[PDB]
Each structure stands twice: as structure tokens, then as C-alpha cells.
Amino acid sequence: MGGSGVEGLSGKRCWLAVRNASLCQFLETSLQRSGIVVTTYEGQEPTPEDVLITDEVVSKKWQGRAVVTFCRRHIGIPLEKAPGEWVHSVAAPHELPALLARIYLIEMESDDPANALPSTD
Numbered sequence: 001m002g003g004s005g006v007e008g009l010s011g012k013r014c015w016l017a018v019r020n021a022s023l024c025q026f027l028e029t030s031l032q033r034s035g036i037v038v039t040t041y042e043g044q045e046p047t048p049e050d051v052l053i054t055d056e057v058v059s060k061k062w063q064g065r066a067v068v069t070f071c072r073r074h075i076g077i078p079l080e081k082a083p084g085e086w087v088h089s090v091a092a093p094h095e096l097p098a099l100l101a102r103i104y105l106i107e108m109e110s111d112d113p114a115n116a117l118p119s120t121d
Contacts, residue, residue: 012037012104013036013038013047013049014039014053015038015039015041015047015052016028016038016041016054017040017054018053018054018055018070019055020090023055027093027096027100030097031100034106036104046062046063047065048063048065049064049065051064051065051068051103051104052066052068052069053069053070053096054067054069054077055069055070055071055090056070056071056090057074057076057077058077059076066085066103067085067086068096068099068103069086069087070095070096071087071089072090074087086099
């Protein structure tokens with residue numbers, strides 16, 4: 001006499017291998033405001049439906065949805081040039097959460113203003 005049912009809430013997952021503690025805390029919290037759950041990617045198994053947010057140069061890679069690596073210049077890291085790898089410079093902390101939203105098809109995906117000034121003289 002009653003009602004029995006299995007309760008289970010879903011949510012987008014993200015793994016991060018950011019060694020920049022202050023930076024990673026900023027981006028992860030900004031993203032978690034959406035209900036997305038982040039987890040540090042160490043000796044774990046990469047998920048095909050999950051993304052790897054990486055900082056600088058990390059020897060371990062990822063096999064899944066996509067990788068978003070923010071390095072100063074990039075060395076032995078896949079420099080994008082492929083529909084799955086995203087290379088970007090850590091110009092500003094806000095660059096990461098914006099890219100994440102675009103990749104995960106979030107409402108706040110936005111667009112790049114391409115801010116440049118033609119100094120032909």
C-alpha cells in the first residue's frame with residue numbers, strides 16, 4: 001500500500017586536468033552554476049560523452065567527446081586542427097567557460113568578437 005520508485009537525477013559531467021588551482025576553481029564554479037558536475041581527471045577512464053578541460057601541457061590524453069586545452073603556447077599537445085581537439089591560449093579566465101558552453105551547446109555559448117586593430121601605419 002503505497003508508491004515505490006527509483007529516483008535518479010541526471011546532469012552533465014566534465015573532467016578537468018587544470019593545474020592552475022585559482023583558474024580551475026573559477027571556471028569550475030562558473031560552470032557548476034548550471035548544475036554540471038566537474039571532477040579532477042587523473043588516473044581515470046575517459047568517457048566518450050564527456051569532455052576533458054586541460055591546462056598547459058599534460059602528458060595524459062583523453063578519448064571521449066572533446067578536449068579543451070588552454071596552454072600558453074602549446075608544445076606536445078594536440079594543437080586543435082581537428083573536429084574534437086580545442087587548443088586555446090590562457091589570455092583571460094573568461095575564455096574557458098565560454099568555450100565550454102559553445103562545445104556543450106549551452107544557451108550561453110556566445111561568439112568571439114575577434115578584437116584586433118589594423119596597424120598598417
